[PDB]
Design a protein around this ligand. Structure first.
Ligand SMILES: CN(O)C(=O)C[C@@H](CCCc1ccccc1)CP(=O)(O)O
Ligand SMILES: CN(O)C(=O)C[C@@H](CCCc1ccccc1)CP(=O)(O)O
Ligand SMILES: [Mn+2]
Ligand SMILES: [Mn+2]
Lengths: 410, 410
């Protein structure tokens, strides 16, 4: 049985994870859900506990902790360990009965739980791209210390890339390791993008797009922050840096391609120039499931891909003039050092300002650019603890610098 | 170093093989061409010998044997073992200095050299699909006896399929072994076809097509027999049976899909419904190379796929009414026993009759259908030598029946 913990079990990733676990378990008993962790959704967590009966429950918000304890008394033949806060999280990661941890939490807590999962040598199914972009150096160092820990990518394009690799090679290395691409014979990556809602818009039209334009009638329905990043293509920019760190692919060997059908999820060109790609309907259940079944696959009842019905797949180059956030991401990744930390942090601020109708489309890239221009490279700390503090300091500085730029112009 | 023999070195597969070997060896010394085998092209063989300096030369036509000996005296610092005929071929197959053998010969001599390669426990890069269709039972039986022999597919779609599989699983089985698909978690195959030159003709237009039409302006340039089979889609029919036998995939799980761009070479759906595909420009060098590098890949200087330039990929269902040979192939495969041997043999005759303007397009499938209707299933010989004789008898009978049917209606 695959023993799995879900962190952020009521968010999008966590709920998709439990859905595919439920459906697969109907076919064959394959997963044991050992732990669920949520912030504050005490009722939703009780409902999940009633179904999956995990050994561990944890809620972050101490003010709903007691409520959770009595709710759970309602469940027949069930006596879970019920914990709360950061230290419940740590206790779950240290448990010897847990093998794989799905990280469906953003920002701080996401990276923090990831760190604890790695320290305990677990398999970590990681969807949070911002943590790889911002703290890649730290994750790489930590993965080198904890030799049995592994990050398995859940971001759909990175899952696709991973699924295009020969496991006889993968098993000789692991993600985020130097030489990953050499060992796997990788030459180049095609990183597929939906292109978002604005591919056909002129520069003058882009000047006036609004957050409602970006959010309304969403092709793929997802959270607000990522929807805005899809609209600017900063999502793909982040995902370029994510690719580089996960797979040790040089930036000149990563090509963003706009594939509006979202059937081909990304492709890998090997050193003989043969190309392998992964394909399915847009659906996060496949990337999540693979992260938990790797290096194997199990049966599902998902809708089979009907290629004849799909009929046409298309591909075109993104215009860097229209989507300047892509160029900024490449520039930051190529400059290296903590420029990716800076890019991510400034985008966090700029994205949210645009979301809330405070700045315009090209102001997003303008602010990010100015913050990047304001950063001086720093010597990279050798010490793991010092390195994490350096990342946090830089993240905080960059957010502040973005906000200060806004406030001046405002 | 990879020690390779090429059987049929002056044909299309053989010359693509030597071209990719030459180019790859410029990058890094990887291949030793140990043996070359041709029918009668003494001058061309001498030129390949001058370049590749193989330890073995073999010519099937005894009447050019002496000529070859003299020619070779022209080569400085070179003293090859120079051989001839079927027995020269057996001698090459049994050499301990040869590891991999490319089978780029058709018909009898293709099957015969394949058998000897297997008997000598070699890796056999097999491009001759007809031998798998006609003699599948015998190849399976032989591979079960010779445990270290392996067939690696070179037919482009079958190479694609093979390239979409995880070698961590492939290495626990082998082509033509029962349970191959189970071990590799295969659910279903998308078998891509160019559709050939007649794909958009109406039924009235099809009645009238000629072999000149099928051979003229050929999308992909290749031999006449396969070009005719591409026109009727019997090529893909044969390739469905090839798929079944190489990969132990049920016929109901093989879908022919027309992909006119010939960039995606075929796709594999796994039991979770994730799909993996292999992609490159139409170029036999990739499938040939992979057959010789598997389970590894090596660097080439081939042109990199430009997906944005390619721009559009399309997929549609073939019409069984317009391409009845497809239906016949499925029916024959599904009925099993030696119906595939009959299908292959009767097609050999019907293809050639049409090529030479003796019958019309729909007569091809008519003759095939009638021969299949005649055939009575036979008890499958347990004995390997007996089984081969049985296949050869059925092949010979089926050709004569096709010819007889032609002669009556003539
Ligand atoms: C899903 N995913 O990993 C995303 O990054 C969102 C992406 C893809 C949305 C379509 C999709 C949804 C689920 C699974 C796969 C693809 C939007 P874009 O490419 O424009 O940046
Ligand atoms: C190349 N190959 O394996 C063929 O069977 C010929 C095939 C594909 C021709 C295009 C092609 C050439 C070289 C390599 C890959 C694809 C024609 P069809 O699909 O109409 O039956
Ligand atoms: Mn993504
Ligand atoms: Mn083929």
């Amino acid at each position: 049985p695959i023993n799995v913990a879900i962190f952020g079990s009521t968010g999008s990733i966590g709920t998709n994870a439990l859905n595919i676990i439920r459906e697969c378990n109907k076919i064959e008993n394959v997963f044991n859900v050992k732990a669920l962790y949520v912030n504050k959704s005490v009722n939703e967590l009780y409902e999940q506990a009633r179904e999956f009966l995990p050994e561990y429950l944890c809620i972050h918000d101490k003010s709903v902790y007691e409520e959770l304890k009595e709710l759970v008394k309602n469940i027949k033949d069930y006596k879970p360990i019920i914990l709360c806060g950061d230290e419940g999280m740590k206790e779950i990661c240290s448990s010897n009965s847990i093998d794989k941890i799905v990280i469906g939490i953003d920002s701080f807590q996401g990276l923090y739980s990831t760190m604890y999962a790695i320290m305990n040598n677990k398999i970590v199914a990681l969807a949070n791209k911002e943590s790889i972009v911002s703290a890649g150096f730290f994750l790489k160092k930590l993965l080198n210390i904890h030799k049995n820990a592994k990050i398995i990518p859940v971001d759909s394009e990175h899952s696709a890339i991973f699924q295009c690799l020969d496991n006889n090679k993968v098993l000789k290395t692991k993600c985020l390791q130097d030489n990953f691409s050499k060992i796997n014979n990788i030459n180049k990556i095609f990183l597929c993008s939906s292109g978002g809602p604005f591919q056909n818009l002129t520069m003058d039209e882009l000047k006036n797009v609004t957050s409602e334009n970006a959010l309304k009638h969403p092709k793929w329905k997802m959270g607000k922050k990522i929807t805005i990043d899809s609209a600017t293509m900063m999502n793909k920019g982040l995902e370029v840096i994510e690719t580089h760190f996960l797979f040790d692919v040089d930036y000149n060997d990563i090509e963003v391609i706009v594939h509006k059908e979202c059937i081909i999820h990304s492709c890998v060109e090997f050193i003989d120039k043969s190309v392998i790609s992964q394909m399915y309907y847009p659906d996060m259940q496949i990337p999540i499931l693979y992260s938990l079944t790797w290096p194997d696959r199990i049966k599902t009842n998902l809708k089979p891909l009907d290629l004849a019905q799909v009929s046409t797949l298309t591909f075109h180059k993104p215009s860097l003039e229209h989507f300047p956030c892509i160029k900024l991401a490449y520039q930051a990744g190529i400059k290296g050092n903590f420029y990716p930390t800076v890019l991510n942090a400034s985008n966090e601020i700029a994205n949210n300002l645009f979301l809330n109708n405070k700045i315009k489309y090209f102001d997003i890239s303008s602010i990010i650019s100015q913050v990047l221009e304001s950063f001086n490279s720093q010597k990279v700390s050798e010490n793991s603890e010092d390195l994490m503090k350096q990342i946090l300091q830089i993240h905080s500085w960059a957010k502040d610098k973005a906000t200060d730029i806004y406030n001046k112009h405002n």
